[PDB]
Amino acid sequence: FGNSLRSKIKAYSELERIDFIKESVDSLTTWMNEERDKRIVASLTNDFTNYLYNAAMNVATIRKAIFHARNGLKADNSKAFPIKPIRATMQSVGNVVVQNTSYIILLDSYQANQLKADSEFKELRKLYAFAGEDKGMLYSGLLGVIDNCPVIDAGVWNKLNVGMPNSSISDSDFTRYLNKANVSNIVTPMQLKEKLNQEDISIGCLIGASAVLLAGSKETRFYIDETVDAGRKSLVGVDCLLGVSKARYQSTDGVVTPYDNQDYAVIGLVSNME
């Protein structure tokens, strides 16, 4: 995938005092950054095997999610399998080791606020202040950590920048970023909202180790073509090939396991935003 810009005639370019190559390269670097990030996010929040849904995020639901990941449970307690942690340390509380586990939680900004305007979160932040554990998080307006798992405000998906998606993203504008060769099924936030509406929303994720697999080159190539319109114009293009896929691990033989059509290390976190 890639994008390009073609300039005005050199007379016009130096008339309006634009250095087309420089500005175009900068703008295309920004575009490609946002595009690869949207690739990762769209693959991440694609069809969800297990997702929790609370009408507003709270440490209740974060704890439930870290819970289901740590022991491998589904929303209806279908008991799939435990999600591998980002980091799995082991410490003894009194005299017994317990193997505490760490994950990552990517929260939509509306979800990050719903968590901020959440009572139990307020008392948790108060307790961290008393202990002096998450120091630098109330000062900085961040979300600190919960149950050893960092909670991250990823952002909002829009035209301008990448962030955690939501049900206002159109179906086409979401499927643009799915490989369609690395995904077996498509479930967009429109479709997910219709799904959980059978019994506007905003998507977040709980992420374990190797939740999303990137194959290929992370590097980006630029192409500068000064010889357009005999030379009056130049064309600047930017291109990269990269395979993104949410780890799914179908099978090898016909044997059925609890891993087959299951997101290896992702739990969905749906919540109303407005």
Partner: protein, 48 residues
């Protein structure tokens, strides 16, 4: 922000917006979908 201008004429600062364009996929030539670089500007006039 200070915009020290030699000859102290009226100034015209400019910004460029995001590239909100779906590019080209695969072997498709760049040119099958060109993006557009939009520039925004405003004029600052002096006062004595």
């Amino acid at each position: 922000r200070l915009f020290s201008v030699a000859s102290q004429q009226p100034f015209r600062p400019r910004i460029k917006a995001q590239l909100t364009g779906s590019g080209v996929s695969g072997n498709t030539d760049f040119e099958a979908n060109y993006d557009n670089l939009e520039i925004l500007s405003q004029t600052i006039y002096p006062d004595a």
